[PDB]
Amino acid sequence: GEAPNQALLRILKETEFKKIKVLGSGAFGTVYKGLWIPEGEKVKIPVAIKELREATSPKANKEILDEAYVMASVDNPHVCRLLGICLTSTVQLITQLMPFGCLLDYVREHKDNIGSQYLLNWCVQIAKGMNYLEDRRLVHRDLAARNVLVKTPQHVKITDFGLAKLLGAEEKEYHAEGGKVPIKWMALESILHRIYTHQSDVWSYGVTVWELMTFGSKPYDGIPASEISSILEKGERLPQPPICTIDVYMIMVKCWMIDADSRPKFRELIIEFSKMARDPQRYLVIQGDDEEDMDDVVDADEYLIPQ
Numbered sequence: 001g002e003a004p005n006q007a008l009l010r011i012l013k014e015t016e017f018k019k020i021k022v023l024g025s026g027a028f029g030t031v032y033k034g035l036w037i038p039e040g041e042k043v044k045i046p047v048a049i050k051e052l053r054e055a056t057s058p059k060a061n062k063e064i065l066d067e068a069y070v071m072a073s074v075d076n077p078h079v080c081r082l083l084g085i086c087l088t089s090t091v092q093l094i095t096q097l098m099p100f101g102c103l104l105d106y107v108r109e110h111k112d113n114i115g116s117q118y119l120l121n122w123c124v125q126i127a128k129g130m131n132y133l134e135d136r137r138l139v140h141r142d143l144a145a146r147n148v149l150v151k152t153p154q155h156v157k158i159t160d161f162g163l164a165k166l167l168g169a170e171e172k173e174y175h176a177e178g179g180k181v182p183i184k185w186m187a188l189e190s191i192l193h194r195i196y197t198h199q200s201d202v203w204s205y206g207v208t209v210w211e212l213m214t215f216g217s218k219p220y221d222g223i224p225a226s227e228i229s230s231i232l233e234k235g236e237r238l239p240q241p242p243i244c245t246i247d248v249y250m251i252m253v254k255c256w257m258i259d260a261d262s263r264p265k266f267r268e269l270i271i272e273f274s275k276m277a278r279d280p281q282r283y284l285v286i287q288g289d290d291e292e293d294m295d296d297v298v299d300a301d302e303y304l305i306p307q
Contacts, residue, residue, distance in 0.1 A: 001169025007073045010084030012036070012094055017086075019049060029053050029090070033097060036083060046097035047083065052090040063162065064091050070161040071095075074136065078129030080149065080159040098157065100150035107145070108216035115289045116243075116280035122148075122156055123209055123273040129158040130205060131266035134198045137167045139174055141196055143204040144185045145211040165196070173197045183228050184219045188258055191229045199260040205269065206255025213241040213248070213284075245283050248276065 016037055023033040032049040052060050068091075071082035086092040100106055103122065107114060126148055133140060140161070147160040163181065165174045176194040187203035189195045207219055219238055223231060237256050240249040251272060255263050264272070276283040 001171075005073055009068065009072050012084040012086045013039075014086055014088055017047065017049070017094070023048065036094065045083070046099070048095045048097045049086075049092055050095070051088075051092040054090075056090050061091055064093060067161050067164075068093060070138065070164045070166070073166075074133070074138070076129060076132040077155075078125045078157050079132060080157050080161075095159075096151075098149035098151050098159075100153065102146050103148040103150055103156055104145035104211060104216055106150050106153075107212055111215045112288060114215070114286075116284035116286055117277065118153060119212055119284055120273055120277040120280055121154065122212060124270060124277055125156050126158060126205065126208065127266050127269040127273060130198075130201060131270060133158075133164075133201075134266055139165050139167060139196050139198060140201050140204070141165065141174075141176075141181065142185075143201055143208055144182065145208050145216070148208070183225045187260070188229070188232050189260060191232075197260060198266070199263050202255050202263045202266065202269075205266070206252045207238065209252055209255075210238045210241065213244055213252075243284050243286050245285065248283050 016039060018034050018037075019032045020034040021032070022030065024031045029050065029052040032051075034047050034049055036045040036047045037043070038045075052064060065085075068082060068085050071080065071093075074080075074082075080098075081096040083094040083096065086094060126143075130140070130143065140158070141163040142160055143158065147158065148156050149159050150156050167174060174196040176190075176196060181190065183191060185204045185207045187196075187200040190200050190203075210219065211217065220228060220231070237253065240246075244252075251264070251269070257263050281289065
């Protein structure tokens with residue numbers, strides 16, 4: 001409702017970029033890694049090139065173009081940057097290269113070197129990115145640790161707008177119709193009535209924090225998708241992660257309250273986590289921050305002649 005979206009969709013020439021090396025595949029198509037070299041300028045831009053499989057499937061191209069639409073309409077330091085699209089046989093999405101990959105695998109692969117400052121700073125950044133999406137009236141619907149990329153260990157950005165929906169002016173909630181949303185990250189109101197709000201994104205934010213706090217655990221590793229709804233109605237929630245003080249765990253818990261308006265607003269999550277980031281060791285308790293055994297070890301240089 002009102003406010004023309006004057007965002008610029010940029011079309012890039014296939015010859016302006018070199019695909020260099022493959023990065024993954026997944027299920028959508030093939031994500032390459034390369035360099036973008038605009039004709040006039042003398043600059044090389046590290047880039048990620050996503051596309052569809054050789055066979056062109058119409059509604060798959062509709063979906064890529066829908067993503068480009070939402071990505072070309074966002075501009076924030078904590079939201080994925082779209083560079084343009086290349087209209088080849090299959091429309092390719094060109095984005096900024098995030099060298100360290102997604103955050104889920106980052107925490108899993110780096111457990112023993114991730115301190116409290118990094119964990120809390122990621123919580124602030126993700127909250128900032130989401131608050132921005134709220135300002136632009138955009139509901140993500142797929143926020144999770146796998147959907148946060150790492151530009152550097154100190155700078156992350158939200159991605160995957162493949163389910164994002166822009167809300168109108170006289171609208172306050174999106175009514176889905178399909179059925180392919182990840183259940184372990186969704187609000188109860190979403191499983192039971194397919195409703196989605198910014199407040200529904202908060203629930204997912206809570207689960208995302210839990211994933212980070214547990215260094216990459218799978219939520220409800222046992223319980224099967226079809227049962228999740230029931231455990232939630234009973235009152236069961238994700239357990240308090242070992243490194244979490246009750247201060248941090250209380251934030252997660254509040255994001256998981258059946259009452260949507262009761263949950264915290266992203267602007268509040270920014271404040272709360274910012275306060276905690278000023279004194280990390282007070283809120284997250286982490287051990288860190290060669291023959292494994294005990295602590296009576298002393299180097300020979302400190303062991304002087306006994307008897």
